[PDB]
Amino acid sequence: VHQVLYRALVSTKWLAESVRAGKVGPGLRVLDASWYSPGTREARKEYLERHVPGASFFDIEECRDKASPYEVMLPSEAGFADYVGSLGISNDTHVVVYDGDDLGSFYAPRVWWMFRVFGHRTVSVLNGGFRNWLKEGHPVTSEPSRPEPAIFKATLNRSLLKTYEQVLENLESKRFQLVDSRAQGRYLGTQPEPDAVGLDSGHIRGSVNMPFMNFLTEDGFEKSPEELRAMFEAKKVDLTKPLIATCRKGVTACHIALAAYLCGKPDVAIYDGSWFEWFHRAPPETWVSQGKG
């Protein structure tokens, strides 16, 4: 089972029984892919302390194009491959991803999207994250997880990724819908982009703003299809037409993609470079801010 539409979301209950069943192994690998702004939370430490039994830590910082000047850029296929392989994940395993965000889901979508872009379809996100796992009393541990290495092969699926040149052309073709998942304020230019030197805020021209946190519920669970569908709609985003999601560094843009997929559209592509690279590569005329004119 890989699918026309594979199980994008698994539940806590689901994960718990699998663990109990002794399901975690070569066919099922769990991953913590938590990441937080420097000086706030310590993901890896947090992970070492308590993690779903048998879970591994997935390091965003390690898994990327270390050689690019931009933030968290996709690694190469070989890179990706060796990485996931060492975590004991083969082309045959079903990958479950989670993060510790208080919102319930921040970085997990990113990892989900990363597997897919590299050619794996059997990957899913724990709905309501570690937040929920804990809140429900599921089993936690600090024991070390040491998976046996597996061989994984990956293949880039160019259609789920967009580059600079491609978003630029889109400026003229207008063929795909550009949706921005950043906080309204950063989108509008009213608030500044954090963790950058000289980086101005604002958005690519003709982009639409869809704040990630709007797809989650107070309890930190994904909204329901009916809910998601009405959202894209109220926003004048047509699931029927082509769509490109962007953000700051192509992280929460993945929340646009997962929401579309549970809505039946699995082909939302992600602008990995995002605003960070855009701001440093494009002509200023291509963007706008509710400030610096």
From Swiss-Prot:
- Reaction catalysis annotation: thiosulfate + hydrogen cyanide = thiocyanate + sulfite + 2 H(+)
Residue list for modification N6-acetyllysine? K13, K135, K162, K174, K223, K235, K236
Q: Which Gene3D superfamilies match?
A: Rhodanese-like domain
CDD domains given in the database record:
TST_Repeats
Q: Name one GO cellular component term.
A: mitochondrial matrix
Catalytic site: C247
Q: Which residues carry this modification: Phosphoserine?
A: S37
The reply on keyword Repeat is yes
Report the glycosylation sites.
S34
Positions where N6-succinyllysine occurs in the chain:
K13, K135, K174, K223, K236
Binding of substrate: at which residues?
R186, K249
Per its UniProt entry, which superkingdom is the organism in?
Eukaryota
Entries under InterPro entries matching the protein: Rhodanese-like_dom, Rhodanese-like_dom_sf, Thiosulphate_STrfase_CS, TST/MPST-like
EC no. given is: 2.8.1.1
Name the tissues where it is expressed. Expressed in numerous tissues.
Tell me the compartments it is located in.
Mitochondrion matrix
GO biological process terms on file: rRNA import into mitochondrion; rRNA transport
**Rhodanese domain segment(s):** 24-142, 172-287
UniProt keyword annotations, A-Z: Acetylation, Glycoprotein, Mitochondrion, Phosphoprotein, Repeat, RNA-binding, Transferase
- What residue spans carry the region label Hinge? 143-158
Q: What does this protein do?
A: Together with MRPL18, acts as a mitochondrial import factor for the cytosolic 5S rRNA. Only the nascent unfolded cytoplasmic form is able to bind to the 5S rRNA. Formation of iron-sulfur complexes and cyanide detoxification. Binds molecular oxygen and sulfur.
User: What does the UniProt entry state concerning the protein's domains?
Assistant: Contains two rhodanese domains with different primary structures but with near identical secondary structure conformations suggesting a common evolutionary origin. Only the C-terminal rhodanese domain contains the catalytic cysteine residue.
* Entry protein name: Thiosulfate sulfurtransferase
Origin species: Bos taurus
